[PDB]
Amino acid sequence: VSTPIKQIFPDDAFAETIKANLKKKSVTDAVTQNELNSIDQIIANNSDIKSVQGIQYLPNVRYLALGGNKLHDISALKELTNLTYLMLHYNQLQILPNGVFDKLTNLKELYLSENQLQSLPDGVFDKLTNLTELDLARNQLQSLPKGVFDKLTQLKDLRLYQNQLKSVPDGVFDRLTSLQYIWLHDNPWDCTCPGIRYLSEWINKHSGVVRNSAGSVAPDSAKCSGSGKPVRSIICPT
Amino acid sequence: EEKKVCQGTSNKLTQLGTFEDHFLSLQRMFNNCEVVLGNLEITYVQRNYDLSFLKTIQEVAGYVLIALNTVERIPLENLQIIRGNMYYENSYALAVLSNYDANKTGLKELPMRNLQEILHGAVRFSNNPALCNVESIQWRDIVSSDFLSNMSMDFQNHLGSCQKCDPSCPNGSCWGAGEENCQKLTKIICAQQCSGRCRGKSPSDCCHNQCAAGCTGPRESDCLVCRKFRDEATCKDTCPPLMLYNPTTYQMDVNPEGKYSFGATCVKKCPRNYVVTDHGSCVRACGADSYEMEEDGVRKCKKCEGPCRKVCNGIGIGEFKDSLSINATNIKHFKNCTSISGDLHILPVAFRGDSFTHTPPLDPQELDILKTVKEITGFLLIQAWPENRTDLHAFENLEIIRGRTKQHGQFSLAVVSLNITSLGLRSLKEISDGDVIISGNKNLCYANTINWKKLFGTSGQKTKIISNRGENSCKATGQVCHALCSPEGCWGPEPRDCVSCRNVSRGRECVDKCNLLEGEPREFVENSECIQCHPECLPQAMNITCTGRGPDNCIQCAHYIDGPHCVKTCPAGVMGENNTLVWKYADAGHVCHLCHPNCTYGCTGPGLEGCP
Ligand SMILES: *[C@@H]1O[C@H](CO)[C@@H](O[C@@H]2O[C@H](CO)[C@@H](O)[C@H](O)[C@H]2NC(C)=O)[C@H](O)[C@H]1NC(C)=O
Ligand SMILES: *[C@@H]1O[C@H](CO)[C@@H](O)[C@H](O)[C@H]1NC(C)=O
Ligand SMILES: *[C@H]1O[C@H](CO)[C@@H](O)[C@H](O)[C@H]1NC(C)=O
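^ Those are the sequences you sent over. The predicted structure of the assembly is below.
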């Protein structure tokens, strides 16, 4: 049995994308499940895609680049369990549903770097024990759920720069034993002791990890709002 | 007939150490020598040295220089000809100068009994006061017409007495004492019937047009020496050409009777050292313009297409030991480089200058030196850059970064903390190993558009794109990929900044469509590349013009057709088999057909009546 492409993928742009992928002539060409099972990468950055509906039927996709599109819903990605790379940078995600990543256990790189997120679901990244890079920069993040990063022990690179965080939960980074790069700058950190103790302590304890715009070791990069002074320079005392 | 060949020399007035070193150096070049392919330079030879070995010489291709010798005699008794390929002061084929010293002693004897012709060049004599007898020599017979204007014949002998030309010589012309030295004449002593030289005075004593010095008969194989080329005991305008035209196959064939030109000799295979040239010569080595490629079994010389590959060290290696960055000192050592065995660092010191190192500030313009680079073996690190430069202009020709070494053992490409607006690495097609970091470039847009995986040759590679310009800003300022670029990104806003073109590409530029119905020139498409259709094919108004690069691949031929090939003029005078010219004519339908064999000088129709 075969089925036309735009029947499976309603979005014109994505249909054109899949057609391009399989070297077909027209979105009206029909395809066999064996042809669908051939797709292991999709490079669809900046293609005006508003919906990836139909992507559920590509079981073997490993490498998925959807950055710079107009996506607001990614529930169709749920069952793609072979996924190892997921680029969703500069799309239109205002909210992630719960358990959206619960299946994606093989993920090693996840970029959500410039969507318009405001909070994160509780335990959204917990099943991602293999993840090595997490980009959450330049969103509108207000606060982090407690122990949001607790499962991310392979993670080497965390990006939180340019958000709207004023405080992080105590001990939020403690389990990041493999962390080599973290970006904290351009947040209005509320350097009010005794609230800011853990973040000062942690930055100080791991000053080598904390990085600036140029990827250089720069533990002063995190700055108190109002003051504009380094977070780690704050001693909040007993 | 095939003689014994000597490379020659072009030292001019230089001396290789001791007079004895010089001499022994000279004797090693011309021992057992008959033909000299370069120039012959007899220099700084002193009295009582045996120049007996020079008698063997018979012809010289370049120029002859006899300078600064105090030896009594130079026995060039058998030199017959100077071709004059090369000139000494760009007028002179033969030059004899200042063979004298303050010891009051000098060169007396120069018996060129047999010097009979100089094809190109003039002569000069100055300050050979010991020398005599040569003043008698009449140079109308030896020299070409065109050159006698640039002759500088100052003869003065005061140093000694000389002998008089044995009366047997004609008009007292001798190269020295004895009738054996009388000047032989073969040009100005002949009836007007003879264009070439002569062996007697009559109009039957004429020689062939291809004889140079003189003759044993009128035939083409009777010359003493050839004007142009010698092909195994005959003299010829040109050697048999390597390519013949096959009129049944319509393409050029290699003729097995073809030969290459070694000096002035026609030879089937060039010598071993040697290489072939586009004109067909066999030559010592290909020009610094060029490199060697063995093609169809022959080692021909091909021209670079770009600066010839040159391999230079990167910073921290060899030349650049204990350096921290490409700086004002060392940036010049990268001139004409194609490939760097190592890493590049362009750091902020380079622009500031460093005084502890004694290093001055770097003039930005000089970064253009790096435009020649197409390969880096290690990493590329740029932490500093001119502030009024939009992109990385110096690296627009960089094709590959192999990353065998890596910054912090991680990054093979690090563009950090710059004011650029685009990367502009238009030519970059592979980053073999090592990661990528583009970080802290506040004005930089376009970076996240690139499908970096397309460049990666090792599977664990990753890209860090952090704190550059916001995509939202970059988008709103219209600094986005061109509409003609693929979804695979760009290095800037232009259609030549694309990584793959959306439809097709012309040059390095990208789409929108290749010239098929409309065309500045019409084109055809293969591998999504717009390719020009051949010139001799007439552009079709309702259909396509070409289906391929060649004149085979055209729909209508503009002018004439020869077999399959559409051609501007039909072959008329081209060489073929059995050493005969080929003549075609066009019929009324502009198809070109072969002429009657008898129509040797050409034709207008079939068989004669074609050939009246
Ligand atoms: C600029 O480049 C020059 C040339 O490579 C460097 O000069 C070398 O400096 C080291 C360190 O002082 C010496 O040990 C070498 O002997 C110098 N070599 C030469 C050829 O002069 C210079 O150090 C570089 N300066 C900077 C700031 O990068
Ligand atoms: C260029 O390609 C795009 C994407 O396939 C398409 O919309 C358009 O058909 C093409 N334009 C041409 C062939 O002129
Ligand atoms: C870029 O150059 C310097 C160094 O990065 C930086 O201070 C400045 O903001 C920029 N200046 C100009 C004139 O573009």
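The helical segments of chain A are 5-8, 12-21, 33-36, 197-205. The longest helix of chain A spans residues 12-21.

Shout if you want it in another format.
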